[PDB]
Design a protein around this ligand. Structure first.
Ligand SMILES: Nc1ncnc2c1ncn2[C@@H]1O[C@H](COP(=O)(O)OP(=O)(O)OP(=O)(O)O)[C@@H](O)[C@H]1O
Ligand SMILES: [Mg+2]
Ligand SMILES: [Zn+2]
Lengths: 292, 157, 288, 98, 86, 190, 218
């Protein structure tokens, strides 16, 4: 069995088709929307490239009353193969907002149509999130975290939105009103730093909230989560001694390099000022002796 | 109907000119955000601009709304609403907002409307206008140049 | 009603992205697909989304107008919404430019005898660049209205006259067989908010300092390059004393100008260094 | 050895403490830690001239209810530090965050 | 950066006449005086270069890695002759 | 008559039994054959469906179609496993009837039962009245555990019992030495 | 290969181009030398066409056959042995040529009085022995246009490398074999370029892999 779940790449077209689907079928609250995620696979980085609508139906009732057309998948498959034979079914996506009960059950329906393990793609179609609204969930079988029967459940994968030449052109044209094309390098890197810090704070607050829930026993005790948290604490370096001295010496060297570079910049500005003053004097002389 | 809609909106704006009826405002603003026809939206925007003629402080709202609206046609109406609210007054809130719109916006139509509105606001200070718009009249974007030409035409009429 | 010049085709984000993806995937074959939209009014032609017609083994000719595929796709797209008409067709002209040919004219005639207001949008994925996607719809001239010489264009607005016809497009004949139209991509707040995600980095990458050996080799190499460039700057200043302007206007065309290299190296190394310092300090303080 | 390391904590240790807590003589503690490191229980390093056995990452143990409160409080303190640092960073450089 | 489509004609830069014009010799056979694109690294316009030209205009639009236009190739290892000084 | 129908075949462990030679599974497949052929003869426009009520939760094998090839291929690839959660199967069958390609064909359901109806009686009556409200017509062909199923089958039909609409017809034919489709040809169909 | 979608392709017309490739062409099989097809309008690579055989080379190797065999040649039995020790022996016994250490011979310049068998021997070699024969007339290489008197020889020697073993056989080479003049005219100067091109592709900065050259004159 292929282990291809290390990295997931989504072209913006799949996601925008998801949004179009959701806004088209007039889905109200609690009504999830589902389609297929046509792309290419068999490599380490699973890549999603094109999607289409599916007639998924489900009543907000017993989780087994879900309905989905079987002929539609193959019927779309034939037409899409006629259009392009390089796009093969690699699973399905649902219109968020988060994992539901039937996700494991319905995934098995796509087992036969797919060749590898079917891929789940959660799409925050209504945009409550702050980071990427997409995450992958490959259904794999692993032992229970509670020391019980091995379960075939979903595993989160690192999903990155990346476009190809065909779709980058359209993405750059569409949002060519809000993206700050000037920006600046160092400024954009520092903004990325601050965004990463805020994301770290948000994840920390979420973990704190979950622990607060577990101490009140609204959730059971998972020893894997607690072990991972204890490992996180163990890996926390102590700074405030040899590491401190090494970091200090590196920072001092690095600041000296910064000093040198700033000196070079200042001298460049000096030459620019000298040349500009020379040209201004020449222009003044030109106007003076040509007027007279 | 897209052929009678523009004229109907314009006549509705002209009939209630200056009064600033609090019901026609809500009706036309709500209807502008529904009609798919492009012409009717701009007609309603211009009618709303005509509605707020003279009511300087009373038309402080509908400027935060329309100049921050999403449909690029409604900001075109916000420019003219600023033009007709602070008409012949030279109030600086309107002028500052008009300049900010005329430099920071994607739809060049709204840039032209904002510059024309700038020309309309300072009609009682026609001496100054060719000094503010002198910087406008050398912008790369041609729509701004047409707007400042119209601003000169309106101001020093 | 002799149409008007203010007619505008509204292309949604879905339609344009699918257009570009299908056009780039078939270079140089002129692939073609239908165009699902709605006729709002006489002046506006809304376009919702497109789907691709198969490219039969014809090569570089737009003649595969297979009806079974169109009928099936239209009928069983209805199962999941998209109840819209067959407003137009799009075919990619990669490399040449935006203009209709005789085969294109015949196909558009076939479409006009079914809807009479069918646009003929022509993508061009090859010569499109990030901000200037070239797109322009077309619709055939009537027929004998050239006897009246009033090709259907009533300039009741300036919104249609602003666009300027292309030079090579007129060579194939623009105002002679198909009056051009306007193109206005209309967005949505949901779509433009969240296509921003293409340039949002992973959260766990900002605080990631890279290996602390490359950050010293790079500094040492940059310093050595700075020393050499400063020496070249000294010899430049020495040589500049006895040169005439007609040479300096073309002197540094073919050789490294040892001033912009100095400024570029300084700025790049300073930016990299500042980012490194900030990352190191931020992690040393917050992580602990 | 493992329970004493996990109770007494301290990334360092001593030969005498291990000898008292394991009943082995102070000469067989070395082989005990040899077995402990080889089997993967710890990842430390011995020091015999001055008996100062150094301890690093220790084999994990199932976490009880009481340990959750201490870890939760440490999380709260860490998150508060992160929030304060983020607030200072945002306030200081608001002129370039665009 | 739209003129840089991918029909192109390889030319050879000969003489930089002005800051924005040059004398290139297109592979078609005849020399031209063309306008250089204002984005190229003008420090790379060494004489006898391998710049690219727009199809019908010949305006210089791209400079190439100067080891690309070569019809003659550096002798590698498959053609390494097998004689020795001995 | 234009009549969209779904066939709820049963593949439970009890349906594996062989009171009807060869097996209740094979007999159900042959009855599906006969029903599809009869519906085709009445009107080819009618679309038939195949939903299996066993194998854990019910799995749709094919949507509303008129071609025997795909469903028959599905019949060869449905293992006899699980129990008959007929409530969920009936709910799924009702859900399918909303998506008829021809929105004019009246809803019809024919369900095959070969196992005890160990479901909530009140929930079953609620399902029956919901099906009647949607004008959904249901027929149940009982052969097998008749002593128990017939306690709830009559209740189902008396809860549906469409007087003027498509009347529900119940069949509880005792296993007899005659062909099953011959038994179902007259009483439930016409 | 400038990039994955930018290639520098020559054209038979002569101009170079910067051409974008299709999506189905295997980019791996694109190195210096592979023939490709270009769409006339947009100049886009379409196919991966194999190596070329110049028509003035097929017109050379497609001679009729010849019905005379080595029996028909009389008197010539020692010289037949000498020729066969270079034409047949290296092509069918390259092991004695290894331990002994001899470098395999390349050329065999048959020569003698006019009318003794210098051509009939070549016809027998074509009929007998085997290997892809290439009969080459002397003047059947020389063309009016510049350089084509040498491009033909270059393709003649390139075809052999792809059809090993090859028994390329010139004839009446005293047309393009003359002692190069020091003050010859323009005509005798372009021929000397052909003599250089022929000369280098026997001992130049490359080794003739498995090509044998038979050479006849009076
Ligand atoms: N040994 C031989 N036995 C029989 N016939 C021979 C022999 N040698 C030559 N011939 C005759 O020579 C004729 C073929 O031409 P021939 O070999 O004389 O030309 P050549 O000497 O190679 O010519 P060139 O002077 O043009 O180089 C045939 O008619 C053939 O019968
Ligand atoms: Mg002869
Ligand atoms: Zn065409």
């Amino acid at each position: 069995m292929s282990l291809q779940h290390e990295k997931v790449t989504i072209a913006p077209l799949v996601l925008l088709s998801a949004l179009d689907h959701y806004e088209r079928t007039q889905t109200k609250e609690n009504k999830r929307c589902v389609g297929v995620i046509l792309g290419d696979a068999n490599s380490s980085t699973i890549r999603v490239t094109n999607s289409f609508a599916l007639p998924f139906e489900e009543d907000e009732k017993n989780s087994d009353v879900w309905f989905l057309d079987h002929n539609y998948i193959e019927n779309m498959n034939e037409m899409c193969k006629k259009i392009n034979a390089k796009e093969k079914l690699i699973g399905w996506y649902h219109s968020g907002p988060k994992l539901r009960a039937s996700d494991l059950k319905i995934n098995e329906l796509f087992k036969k149509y797919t060749q590898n393990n079917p891929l789940l793609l959660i799409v925050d179609v209504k945009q409550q999130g702050v980071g990427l609204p997409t995450d992958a969930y490959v259904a794999i079988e692993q032992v229970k975290d509670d020391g019980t029967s091995t379960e075939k459940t979903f595993l989160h994968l690192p999903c990155t939105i990346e476009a190809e030449e065909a779709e980058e052109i359209g993405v750059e044209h569409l949002l060519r009103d809000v993206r700050d094309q000037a920006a600046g390098g160092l400024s954009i890197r520092l903004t990325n730093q601050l965004k990463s810090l805020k994301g770290l704070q948000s994840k920390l607050k979420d973990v704190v909230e979950y622990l607060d829930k577990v101490i009140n026993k609204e959730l059971p005790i998972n020893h894997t989560i607690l072990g991972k948290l204890q490992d996180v604490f163990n890996l926390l370096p102590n700074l405030g001694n040899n590491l401190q001295k090494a970091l200090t010496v590196k920072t001092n060297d690095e600041l000296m390099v910064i000093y040198i570079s700033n000196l070079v910049r200042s001298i460049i500005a000096f030459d620019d000022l000298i040349e500009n003053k020379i040209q201004n004097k020449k222009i003044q002389e030109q106007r003076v002796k040509d007027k007279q | 109907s897209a052929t009678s809609g523009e004229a109907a909106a314009l006549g509705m704006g002209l009939c209630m000119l200056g009064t600033g009826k609090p019901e026609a405002i809500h009706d036309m603003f709500t209807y502008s955000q529904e009609t798919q026809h492009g012409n009717i939206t701009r007609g309603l925007a211009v009618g709303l601009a005509l509605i707020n003629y003279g009511r300087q402080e009373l038309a402080d709202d509908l400027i935060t709304k329309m100049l921050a609206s999403d449909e690029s046609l409604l900001r075109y109406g916000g420019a003219f609403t600023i033009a007709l609210a602070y008409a012949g007054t030279g109030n600086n809130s309107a002028v500052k907002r008009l300049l900010h719109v005329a430099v920071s916006d994607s739809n060049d139509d709204v840039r032209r409307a904002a510059v024309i509105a700038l020309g309309f606001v300072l009609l009682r200070d026609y001496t100054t206008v060719p000094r503010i718009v002198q910087l406008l009249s050398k912008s790369h974007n041609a729509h701004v140049r047409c707007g400042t030409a119209f601003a000169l035409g309106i101001a020093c009429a | 009603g002799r149409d008007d010049t203010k007619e505008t085709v509204y292309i949604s984000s879905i339609a344009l992205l699918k257009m570009l993806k299908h056009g780039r995937a078939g270079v140089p074959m002129e692939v073609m697909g239908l165009m699902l939209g709605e006729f709002v009014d006489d002046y506006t032609v809304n376009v919702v989304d497109v789907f691709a017609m198969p490219q039969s083994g014809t090569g570089v000719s737009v003649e595969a107008v297979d009806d079974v595929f169109q009928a099936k796709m239209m009928d069983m797209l209805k199962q999941t919404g998209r109840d819209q008409m067959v407003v137009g067709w799009y075919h990619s002209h990669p490399g040449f430019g935006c203009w209709l040919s005789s085969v294109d004219v015949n196909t558009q005639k076939s479409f006009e005898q079914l809807n009479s207001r069918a646009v003929a949008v022509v993508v061009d994925p090859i010569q499109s660049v990030k901000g200037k996607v070239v797109i322009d719809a077309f619709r055939l001239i009537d027929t004998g209205a050239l006897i009246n010489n009033l090709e259907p264009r009533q300039t009741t607005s300036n919104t249609g006259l602003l666009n300027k016809a292309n030079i090579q497009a007129l060579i194939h004949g623009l105002n002679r067989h198909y009056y051009s139209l306007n193109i206005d991509y209309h967005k949505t707040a949901k779509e433009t908010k969240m296509l921003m995600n293409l340039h949002k980095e992973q959260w766990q990458s900002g605080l990631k300092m890279y290996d602390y050996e490359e950050k010293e080799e790079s500094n040492l190499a940059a310093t050595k390059s700075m020393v050499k460039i400063a020496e070249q700057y000294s010899k430049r200043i020495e040589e500049e004393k006895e040169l005439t302007e007609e040479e300096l206007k073309t002197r540094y065309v073919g050789r490294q100008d040892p001033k912009k290299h100095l400024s570029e190296t300084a700025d790049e190394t300073l930016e990299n260094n500042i980012v490194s310092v900030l990352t190191a300090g931020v992690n040393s303080v917050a992580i602990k | 050895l493992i329970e004493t390391v996990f109770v007494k904590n301290i990334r360092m240790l001593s030969f005498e403490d291990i000898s008292k807590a394991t009943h082995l003589p102070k000469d067989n503690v070395e082989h005990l830690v040899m077995r402990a490191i080889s089997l993967g229980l710890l990842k430390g390093s011995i020091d015999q001239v001055n008996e100062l056995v150094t301890i690093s990452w220790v084999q994990p143990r199932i976490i009880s209810g009481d340990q959750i409160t201490k870890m939760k409080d440490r999380l709260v303190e860490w998150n508060d530090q992160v929030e304060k640092l983020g607030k200072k960073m945002e306030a200081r450089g608001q002129s370039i965050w665009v | 950066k739209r003129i840089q489509s991918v029909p192109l004609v390889i030319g050879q830069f000969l003489e930089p006449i002005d800051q924005n014009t040059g004398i290139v010799s297109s592979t078609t056979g005849m020399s031209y005086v063309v306008r250089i694109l204002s984005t190229l690294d003008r420090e790379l316009l060494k004489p006898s270069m391998s710049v690219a030209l727009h199809r019908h205009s010949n305006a210089l639009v791209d400079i190439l890695p100067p080891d690309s236009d070569s019809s003659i190739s550096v002798m590698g290892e498959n053609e390494k002759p097998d004689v020795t000084y001995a | 008559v234009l009549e969209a129908t779904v066939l709820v075949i049963d593949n439970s462990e009890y349906s594996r039994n062989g009171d009807f030679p060869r097996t209740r599974f094979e007999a159900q497949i042959d009855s599906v054959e006969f029903i599809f052929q009869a519906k085709r003869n009445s009107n080819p426009e009618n679309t038939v469906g195949l939903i299996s009520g066993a194998g854990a939760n019910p799995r749709v094998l094919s949507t509303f179609t008129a071609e025997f090839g795909k469903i028959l291929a599905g019949l060869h690839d449905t293992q006899i496993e699980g129990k008959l959660h007929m409530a969920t199967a009936l709910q799924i069958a009702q859900l399918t009837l909303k998506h008829r390609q021809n929105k004019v064909q009246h809803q019809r359901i024919v369900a095959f039962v070969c196992s005890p109806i160990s479901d909530s009686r009140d929930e079953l009556i609620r399902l029956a009245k919901t099906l009647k409200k949607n004008n959904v017509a249901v027929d149940i062909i009982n052969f097998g555990e008749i002593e128990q199923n017939t306690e709830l089958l009559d209740e189902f039909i008396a809860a549906v019992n469409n007087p003027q609409e498509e009347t529900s017809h119940l069949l509880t034919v005792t296993p007899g030495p005659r062909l099953l489709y011959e038994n179902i040809a007259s009483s439930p169909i016409i | 290969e400038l990039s994955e979608e930018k290639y520098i392709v020559k054209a038979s017309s002569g101009p170079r181009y910067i051409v974008g490739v299709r999506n189905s062409v295997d980019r791996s099989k694109l190195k210096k030398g592979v023939r490709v097809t270009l769409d006339i309008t947009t100049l886009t690579i379409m196919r991966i066409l194999p190596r070329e055989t110049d028509p003035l080379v097929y017109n050379m190797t497609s001679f009729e056959q010849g019905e005379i065999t080595f029996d028909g040649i009389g008197g010539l039995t020692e010289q037949i042995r000498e020729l066969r020790e270079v034409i047949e022996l290296p092509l069918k016994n390259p092991e004695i040529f290894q331990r002994v250490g001899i470098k395999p011979p390349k050329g065999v310049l048959l020569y003698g009085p006019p009318g003794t068998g210098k051509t009939l021997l070549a016809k027998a070699v074509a009929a007998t022995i085997g290997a892809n024969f290439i009969f080459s007339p002397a003047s059947g290489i020389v063309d009016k246009y510049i350089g084509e008197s040498a491009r033909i020889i270059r393709e003649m020697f390139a075809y052999a490398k792809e059809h090993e073993p090859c028994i390329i056989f010139m004839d009446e080479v005293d047309a393009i074999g003359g002692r190069r003049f020091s003050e010859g005219t323009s005509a005798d100067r372009e021929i000397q370029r052909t003599l250089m091109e022929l000369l280098t592709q026997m001992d130049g900065f490359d080794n003739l892999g498995q090509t044998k050259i038979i050479m006849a004159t009076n």
